[PDB]
Amino acid sequence: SMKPGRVTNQLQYLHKVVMKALWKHQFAWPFRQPVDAVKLGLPDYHKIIKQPMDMGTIKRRLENNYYWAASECMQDFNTMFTNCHIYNKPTDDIVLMAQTLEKIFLQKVASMPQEEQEL
Numbered sequence: 477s478m479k480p481g482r483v484t485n486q487l488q489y490l491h492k493v494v495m496k497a498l499w500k501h502q503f504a505w506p507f508r509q510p511v512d513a514v515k516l517g518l519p520d521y522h523k524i525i526k527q528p529m530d531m532g533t534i535k536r537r538l539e540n541n542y543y544w545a546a547s548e549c550m551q552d553f554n555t556m557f558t559n560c561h562i563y564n565k566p567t568d569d570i571v572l573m574a575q576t577l578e579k580i581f582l583q584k585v586a587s588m589p590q591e592e593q594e595l
Contacts, residue, residue: 486546
């Protein structure tokens with residue numbers, strides 16, 4: 477991080493509303509921790525996916541006031557979702573799970589405060 481972490485109204489919303497809804501969802505389980513490509517038998521995962529990202533990592537970052545700005549957290553979420561769409565076959569079950577979470581993410585983000593302020 478070039479910037480210190482802090483708390484903004486948008487980051488607090490991403491934590492207390494958006495992550496709260498996503499973490500507990502029944503389709504969250506493939507996304508709660510980093511992909512372990514050896515354990516899962518995915519030998520080219522790290523050749524294909526340049527920036528792994530997962531909700532466990534995002535949740536820890538939110539808990540530890542890691543982020544400087546909400547866009548940084550948003551970028552992490554969209555990287556996680558994109559990695560799934562890129563790596564997986566369109567017919568893989570995990571793609572449906574990611575799509576379901578994306579819809580929830582978008583629905584919650586639609587009610588986030590739209591001007592960012594430090595707390």
